[PDB]
Structure 1
């Protein structure tokens, strides 16, 4: 038996058998007063100490959220839905520590994605035991409030200031600082890493002064705050809030009176209305997300980035080959996970109307013109592939490249990756390629388990990525130094070198999506 004394009370863990060794796991440690009753929509509050032994032996509740439902019984979408009860009582975190207790281990903290509306840390693909076992790092992950209960904003009004989920994350970073030593971790070697909306969270911690001292380094997988979906303007945050207050019968004049009305509604009353606070959405709609609150974010983050106002440290940044395709089956016409989704030129034009609803007719012709310079005119997948690339280049790749250029221009080492391996167990059809979210299982080392029917090539690749990520955490340099690997060069503005990850041959390339990204980053803003 292992029991650890944390600054708030004793916690009891459990021991897991991994790869013929042992990992000690502490699942569901509370790290904040439960945000219930009058605490709804507030920043997380400090935890009251307990005298007993807390039995952190099962994953805790996941924060309230809407469950994905487009494909009932389909593992491709259900692997992402929560696997514990939904409750507002959900501010818990998990800790995996090597066996035996390490002396001064580097800590990796995971922040999951889910478009700031969904997510939970108990997903199978976020299991930190393999990293603990294989690399002797400590893995920490936390749950944070999502959707309206996590990001509803009437800015200035402390009854609902916005960024609550971000502050949840922050409080858990504070917990690791205050307690990870007791578990044998080094609070001075802490690396945030997250994917998608989690990677945008990580990026906002680089800007938040409150977070500057809570971590060492940062890994952004398929996400950054400069992505078009990542920050809600204060105008939209208030229209979205008033709309939700109308939809629930909570419109009052005194803005503080609205919040107490919203606090009396049931979580499902709010959750059911979240979809309609936007009149016309897109599949990338983030109805309740980060805002410039003047607390976590002291100014519009793009100004902070451009004027070097962020934590100076190393970053690891990267994207997947086919980021956009996932969104194509959540709304684009003629697309389906059950057929090859060959679409015509007309269907592609309505696809753009879906993803760019408020963009001029001239804007849409420019996208079309930029993305229909056929290598082979006769290829009938042409429009299908072009539409996924539009959505992927615009929503993930180009913003991550622009983030890495601007960040590295202030002198810190940056490393960029292009993940282009399609998991042999990927349940979505082949036309969807190397989708959003399906490098995570490689980062967490799931293919290291030989019983899981990943290929041998996948064991090698995951083993190399795990070593690169751990080396980045431990030493701020993502090399694999022992197995004649390709050396991973720094991303410099005036060359823009990146590393491709795959099974066949890891190579160095330059200026990824150069022409696409000039279009989206420089020209398209003018339309």
Structure 2
């Protein structure tokens, strides 16, 4: 019973599709295309249009490398891509209403991903929760995060945070236009995973983002993840420019270079997280963790968590983690934790069972993910902001169970997109999957609607506090566990 549904935005009318249970608008522009003079420059509001704009099709993704690690396990194709990528997608029960709004920032290391990916489909959230869901694209890679302040001067001030500024523009668009799609502009929750959660953590710090959301969910990511000093960022940028072949100060070459060549130059630097939001002193005045300590988000309610076996995802690329090679493992640990590596290795090697890599995978999970989660939770608890903590323990059985509860596994559970294409390849085909997704899905709904994640499906979920450190565990049997990271937190402090 699918029918076109037209809604009018400040810029113009948009044509979307509805079965009547739910409506969707795809490829709605929240900014003018960041091309030519707008390339490497802050996002600009879209030009108004006459006529009814088609919102039946997704916008192109930002230019990106293949980053096929998830894709090799999944069946996913390369994303259709263009420098003109600034589009958002809206799911709503109805254009009439003032519903709670959930705004999603995708992950992928500030280099890959898109709002258009099917696992981020908002239909189920909207239907079950009576909420409006928004997914968005932001500039990725060099075009989003290249710090050009030193190389090209003040005209490019803020260049390191362009992707963040895109996210802020989308949030501005929502404030202005969400009512037309049945959303409440005053009731907006931002949620992200990985680099998206890192993005959310930055937005809590950023003055430009203030007042644009009231609540935040950070999944497998935090303000600690990926944030760069201006100096570190300028060094990376020099390397990228070298690969690109653009001399510092050469404006014509900068605008002239094709977008794909920017992607290739970043790829040339090699694997890791070389690009990220920058403490530039404007968009980001301070480090996000410093802002949290200061009480910058004391009004904002936070749901924050991690998966039990985060780093195991990386084993798909690098199988040392499934092995017992000490020299190789030491190198990898040392890359992340530098001088502390030796002491921490001794603590983790003693704990657990199996291969050394299996025993060291928690140390990598803690350094990269758990530390940020806990610092976020602790800062909010100290300021007295409402905060809830979770650990997702449901394991995928795929590839002999070696992934466990790996990074990104929670995403279909939160969105209830388990049946969507490629998800089952990641999550396995177990029937217990659906029950776990329901409890998580409904908690995300509940948080956005009332600022409390508790629902009847769950056991009682206490706010996270320094004394008890209560953490909800999503598992076949959901439970609250108190101070689960205690042993680790003490040893890391030692």
Normalised by the length of structure 1, the TM-score is 0.86
- Aligned residue number for residue 440 of structure 2: 465
- The structure 2 residue matched to 1:179, chosen from 171, 177, 180, is 177
Whether the 8 Å CA contact 2:298–2:383 is kept in 1: the answer is no
- Aligned residue number for residue 439 of structure 1: 410
Pick closer, same or farther for the CA change 1:5–1:70 going to 2, 3 Å.
Answer: closer
Whether the 8 Å CA contact 2:396–2:404 is kept in 1: the answer is no
Residue 10 (str. 1) matches residue 13 (str. 2): yes
Equivalent-residue separation in structure 2 for 1:232 and 1:87 (angstroms): 26
Residue 513 (str. 1) matches residue 485 (str. 2): yes
| CA positional deviation for 1:385 | 1.3
Equivalent-residue separation in structure 1 for 2:268 and 2:90 (angstroms): 37
How many pairs were matched up? Answer: 483
Residue 33 (str. 1) matches residue 32 (str. 2): yes
- Aligned residue number for residue 86 of structure 2: 91
1:378-457 equivalence runs, <5 A? 379=353, 381-423=354-396, 427-447=398-418, 454-457=429-432
- The structure 2 residue matched to 1:304, chosen from 268, 284, 291, is 291
| CA positional deviation for 1:462 | 1.6
Equivalent-residue separation in structure 2 for 1:241 and 1:258 (angstroms): 14
Root mean square deviation, CA, Å: 2.3
Equivalent-residue separation in structure 2 for 1:405 and 1:316 (angstroms): 12
Pick closer, same or farther for the CA change 1:501–1:123 going to 2, 3 Å.
Answer: same
Q: Per-residue CA shift, 1:423-481, capped at 9, x if unaligned?
A: 46xx45411101100111010012488x9795443322222222111111010111113
Equivalent-residue separation in structure 1 for 2:163 and 2:317 (angstroms): 25
| CA positional deviation for 1:348 | 3.6
Pick closer, same or farther for the CA change 1:137–1:102 going to 2, 3 Å.
Answer: farther
SS at match of 1:275: helix
Equivalent-residue separation in structure 2 for 1:151 and 1:87 (angstroms): 17
Unaligned 5+ segments in structure 1 are 336-340
Whether the 8 Å CA contact 1:147–1:287 is kept in 2: the answer is no
| CA positional deviation for 1:90 | 0.3
- Aligned residue number for residue 340 of structure 2: 363
- The structure 1 residue matched to 2:306, chosen from 304, 319, 327, is 319
Q: Which stretch has the larger CA shift, 5-14 or 323-332?
A: 323-332
| CA positional deviation for 1:69 | 4.1
| CA positional deviation for 1:354 | 2.6
Pick closer, same or farther for the CA change 1:240–1:193 going to 2, 3 Å.
Answer: same
Pick closer, same or farther for the CA change 1:372–1:355 going to 2, 3 Å.
Answer: closer
Whether the 8 Å CA contact 1:212–1:311 is kept in 2: the answer is no
SS at match of 2:21: strand
Unaligned 5+ segments in structure 2 are none
Equivalent-residue separation in structure 1 for 2:355 and 2:231 (angstroms): 38
Normalised by the length of structure 2, the TM-score is 0.92
- Aligned residue number for residue 46 of structure 1: 45
- Aligned residue number for residue 250 of structure 1: 246
1:202-221 equivalence runs, <5 A? 202-221=200-219
SS at match of 1:48: coil
Q: Per-residue CA shift, 1:275-334, capped at 9, x if unaligned?
A: 344xxx6x5x2111100122221123232222223352211011101101112332353x
- Aligned residue number for residue 188 of structure 2: 190
- The structure 2 residue matched to 1:140, chosen from 116, 131, 134, is 134
Whether the 8 Å CA contact 1:247–1:273 is kept in 2: the answer is yes
SS at match of 1:87: coil
Equivalent-residue separation in structure 2 for 1:204 and 1:70 (angstroms): 26
Equivalent-residue separation in structure 2 for 1:82 and 1:134 (angstroms): 31
Bigger fraction of residues in helix: 2
Residue 497 (str. 1) matches residue 474 (str. 2): no
Q: Which stretch has the larger CA shift, 429-438 or 298-307?
A: 298-307
- The structure 2 residue matched to 1:231, chosen from 209, 227, 233, is 227
- Aligned residue number for residue 66 of structure 2: 67
- Aligned residue number for residue 338 of structure 1: none
- The structure 2 residue matched to 1:104, chosen from 90, 95, 98, is 98
Whether the 8 Å CA contact 2:345–2:363 is kept in 1: the answer is no
SS at match of 2:291: helix
SS at match of 2:92: strand
Whether the 8 Å CA contact 2:289–2:375 is kept in 1: the answer is no
| CA positional deviation for 1:259 | 4.5
| CA positional deviation for 1:384 | 2.5
| CA positional deviation for 1:5 | 0.6
| CA positional deviation for 1:514 | 1.8
1:92-171 equivalence runs, <5 A? 92-98=87-93, 100-155=94-149, 157-159=154-156, 161=158, 162-171=160-169
